[PDB]
């Protein structure tokens, strides 16, 4: 079940972060798109089906290995989303989150040097949340963040998909 009406909660998450459409430089070595992601989130529940949550996300640093051209990409941001869900069971809920993330992206490379930019990306997430106790809930979700960057400012604009496990505490 969802947090009580008009109550607050806080939480944190760890996840498998994977960047997509990572075109950047012509590195001859490996590009490790898979990284450990991390985030913290807080939320307010309006009714059993609707809540609002805010959080910080660390999406991981992607290396572009190579003997000639090489570099790295990094991204993080703050997000705000509406959480919409309904129960599968009395303790297990299914949900989606929709909103946006304000991100800062940095790239490093010998080719282009150090670059960074800020912008806005939409966030689409879906998952399930299980109430272990009235205060503790665990969640499994997949979060998609679209077009994190800009080809003209940092040379790349990858997408990010993050499969994460999370825990939250409810203060109702």
């Amino acid at each position: 079940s969802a947090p009580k009406d008009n109550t607050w909660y806080t939480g944190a998450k760890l996840g498998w972060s994977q960047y997509h459409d990572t075109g950047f430089i012509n590195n001859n070595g490996p590009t490790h798109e898979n990284q450990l992601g991390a985030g913290a989130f807080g939320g307010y529940q309006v009714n059993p089906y609707v809540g609002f949550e805010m959080g910080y996300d660390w999406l991981g640093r992607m290396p572009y290995k190579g003997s000639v051209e090489n570099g790295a990409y990094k991204a993080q941001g703050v997000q705000l989303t509406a959480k919409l869900g309904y129960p599968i069971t009395d303790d297990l809920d299914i949900y989606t989150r929709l909103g946006g993330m304000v991100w800062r992206a940095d790239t490093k490379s010998n080719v282009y040097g150090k670059n960074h930019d800020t912008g806005v990306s939409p966030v689409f997430a879906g998952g399930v949340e299980y109430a272990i106790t009235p205060e503790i809930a665990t969640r499994l979700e997949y979060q998609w963040t679209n077009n994190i960057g800009d080809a003209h400012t940092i040379g790349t604009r990858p997408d990010n998909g993050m499969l994460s496990l999370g825990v939250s505490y409810r203060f109702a």
Partner: nanobody, 117 residues
Framework: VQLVESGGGLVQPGGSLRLSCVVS??????????MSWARQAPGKEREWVSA???????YYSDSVRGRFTISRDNAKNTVYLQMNNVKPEDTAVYYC????????????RGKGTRVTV
């Protein structure tokens, strides 16, 4: 992005010569701009010869390694190609290229400068 090459001329075998490429225009940051030097010899296709990245790392074709030296002066938006111990094979028109963020290729937008050994 505008590129103008200079420094070419007549030189004897074993001689030395320095070419220059001055970058001007808008919409680009020279200090972050990777640059290259290519050449087209008589009756041959254009050959890449050298490149210098934003971190000042340098790269050379085997045909010029140990004889040519690429360098940059970010205060003057200028790239140089110092040519030593020139061979008859070095006779060519030399072009400099500018690579944009988002592209792996260099744009050779200049008129070139001709070296004759």
């Amino acid at each position: 992005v505008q590129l103008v090459e200079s420094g070419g001329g007549l030189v004897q075998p074993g001689g030395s010569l320095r070419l220059s490429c001055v970058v001007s225009g808008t919409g680009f940051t020279f200090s972050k701009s990777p640059m290259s030097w290519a050449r087209q010899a008589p009756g041959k296709e254009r050959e890449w010869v050298s490149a210098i990245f934003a971190d000042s790392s340098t790269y050379y074709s085997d045909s010029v390694r140990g004889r040519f030296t690429i360098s940059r002066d970010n205060a003057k938006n200028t790239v140089y190609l110092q040519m030593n111990n020139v061979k008859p094979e070095d006779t060519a028109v030399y072009y400099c290229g500018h690579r944009r963020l988002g592209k792996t290729t260099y744009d050779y937008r200049g008129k070139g400068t001709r070296v004759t050994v």
